[PDB]
Structures are given as C-alpha cells and as structure tokens.
Design an enzyme around this catalytic site. Structure first.
Site, short mmCIF file in Angstrom:
data_model
loop_
_atom_site.label_atom_id
_atom_site.label_comp_id
_atom_site.label_asym_id
_atom_site.label_seq_id
_atom_site.Cartn_x
_atom_site.Cartn_y
_atom_site.Cartn_z
N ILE A 104 56.73 -85.48 10.60
CA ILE A 104 57.28 -86.64 9.90
C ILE A 104 58.60 -87.10 10.53
O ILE A 104 59.38 -86.28 11.07
CB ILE A 104 57.37 -86.34 8.37
CG1 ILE A 104 57.85 -87.55 7.54
CG2 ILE A 104 58.21 -85.09 8.07
CD1 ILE A 104 57.57 -87.40 6.06
N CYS A 105 58.85 -88.41 10.45
CA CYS A 105 60.18 -88.99 10.67
C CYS A 105 60.56 -88.89 12.14
O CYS A 105 59.88 -89.52 12.97
CB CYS A 105 61.18 -88.32 9.71
SG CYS A 105 62.94 -88.74 9.96
N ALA A 106 61.54 -88.12 12.57
CA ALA A 106 61.94 -88.00 13.97
C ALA A 106 61.05 -87.02 14.73
O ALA A 106 61.11 -87.00 15.96
CB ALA A 106 63.38 -87.53 14.09
#
Lengths: 195, 195
Positions: A104-106
């Site tokens: 997820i995300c970065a």
C-alpha cells in the site's frame, strides 16, 4: 487457517499498518507482525510517532507459513523495506511460492519497482508517486488486484479498509469480507462485498 | 499550538486510536497518549492484538494543557475507562473547564452515559449500542458535534477519519482539516472540508 505476515519498519505508516492488521484479525486471519531492518528490535516508531511492538524479527518468521505478506507504506518505512535484502528476498519468495504480495501507499513504487519484483502486472500506489510506477503498469484505483501475479496494491491511509477487505475476500471469501465490512460503519463509497 | 490527550486502555480499538492520532499529528496537533491501565502499564494490547505504547500513565499527564481529551472505543477499553475514577474525573474536568470531549464507538455509551457526564447534548456511538444512548440524545450520524456542551462523538472504526478530521477542524480550522483530508485518498462519503 489463513495467516498473514505484516511487516513493520521505522517510519511505516501506522494507520495503514494497524487498520490492515485489525481487519485481517476481524476476518479470522492470524496476523504476525515482523520488525524489519532493526537488527531484531521489536519497538517500531511509525511515521507520525505511534510506537508499536512487533511480534518477532523478520529473520525469525520470514520462512513461515503465511498466505500473504503485507507491506505498509510510509515513505521512510518503505525505503527501509527497499534497502533490506531480507525483506526483498522474502517478498520474492512469497511470490515464487504462489502466495500473495500486498503493498500500500509508498510501498509499490519504493519497494516493488526498484527491484523489478513485478515487472508486468497492474499496480497502484500513492497518487503523487504515480510517476515512479511504470506507465504501462499504473492504474489510479483505490485497490488493484492482479490475479495473474497475485499482487494486491492500494493507495493511501484512506484506502486501508478497501485494502484489508480485499485480502479477506481473497483468503477467506466474500461472505467474510462482507461480515467484517458490515461492522465497521464504512463510508459510502467503499465496496462492502454484499451479495 | 493545539494539543490532544488520547487515552488508551487494554482492549482499546486500535484502528480508532491510531487513525485519530495519525490525523491529529498530520494536523499539527501535539498528541500525548495516556495509558488508563489500572496498574500504569504503558505497553497496551489492543482489541485485535496490536501492541501500542502509550507515552505516559494518565496520572502523570491528566492535569496537562490539552484542548481535547479523546476516548477511543473497543468494548473492553471503554470498560476500563468507565471503571477508572481518574479517567472519569479527568473527562469531567475537561468538560467543566470549557475544553472538548471526543469519544468514538463504544466510548459514548460505556463511559459517558453511565456517569451522566452529558445529561443534555446530542451524541452518537456504535450503532448496535444505540439502545444504550437515551433516545432524546441519539443521532445516527457518522460524526456528531454538539457545540453547546463541546461533545464530539463518532460511530466506529470506519468513521475514524471523519472523527479525526473534525478534531482538526475544531482545534486548528477548516483549512487544515481540508489539507489533511486531501493527503489521505479518502472515500467519497467522508466530508472533505472543501466548498
């Protein structure tokens, strides 16, 4: 009997990590948290200062029986993951052994892309890191599941529910995803897996 | 500038607590986490097994300069709060001194109602516990803000973003709430402080 390995590093995004853990446990999935790149220290200070205690060092659990490995975001946590040979090899091993990688995300741009772990295969991540993900792979979607490579990705702290629910759907089934979703008081635009 | 005292107990709901802390920090609010564990233990095992570390035992920080006291839910964590004389004393003092009480999930029905801290005021909480909130006070809204008594309540793990953003709106303002919201990739049914 499903189980998940959730990785934690200094600077991991605590909402992403904790929301995911909580949902998986609500789904009846056994969660182990692993400390990464701390030489075994279980105390993890997350990106906004939340302090967690991991269950075990990654090196002690990396070879276990999990169905999914979860990589929370948080740019500095994700950089620790990227720069950990053990983490990267473990992710590769989960994939090659037919298990799910969930990021997820970065984490997609920071961990998966530089190591070419999933060089074809649809993927999302935090939108302002879109340019770090190869053009032909990128999708701007809250959650992306690519069954061909068993890669689940998602975008940000606000998509952590969507992310956790899709893990439940994949490991436990749709009915259990809905059972969990139905008890969260979720915002209207999030899929709840109902019939 | 603004500060928040976020209380934690064995059995607190970790998504509610951690999402709130994260958003408040993103909002530029100084967060102190206080353990309400009766023995003063700071290493708290939350409702789905996440181990969070509180900054301080409540006795050491209850008298501090904070603009808001935050009560996460989780059934057993809210019971701990209810059964802590110091917690209850502290919530009453925040209220009587013109500061904000913020409670989510199980906390309104389990802590506020039995102690009759808010005999007047609108409130919400976890919907399956609605019957535990007097009908004349109950609203079925993701977040309820009653400025008359400075009581902020919210419903569940899935409303933790809404809850945290409203704390930011009240402590810092609309611009900061929108700023924080815009970083989260939050779902469409959460108010984003635009217009």
């Amino acid at each position: 009997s499903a189980s998940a390995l959730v990785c934690l590093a200094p600077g991991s995004e605590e909402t992403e990590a904790v929301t995911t853990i909580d949902l998986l446990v609500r789904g009846g999935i056994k969660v182990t948290t692993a400390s990464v790149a701390s030489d075994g220290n279980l105390a993890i200070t997350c990106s906004r200062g939340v302090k967690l205690l991991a269950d075990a060092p990654l090196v002690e659990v990396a070879d276990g029986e999990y169905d999914v490995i979860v990589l929370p975001g948080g740019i500095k946590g994700a950089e620790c993951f990227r720069d950990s040979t053990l983490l990267v090899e473990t992710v590769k091993q989960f994939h090659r052994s037919g298990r799910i990688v969930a990021a997820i995300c970065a984490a997609p741009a920071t961990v998966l892309v530089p190591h070419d772990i999933f060089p074809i295969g649809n993927m999302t991540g935090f939108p302002t890191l879109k340019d770090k993900i190869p053009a032909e792979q990128w999708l701007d979607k809250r959650v992306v599941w690519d069954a061909r490579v068993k890669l689940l990705t998602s975008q940000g702290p606000g998509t952590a529910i969507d992310f956790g629910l899709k893990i439940i759907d994949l490991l436990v089934g749709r009915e259990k995803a809905h059972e969990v979703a139905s008890q969260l008081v979720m915002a209207a635009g999030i899929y709840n897996y109902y019939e």
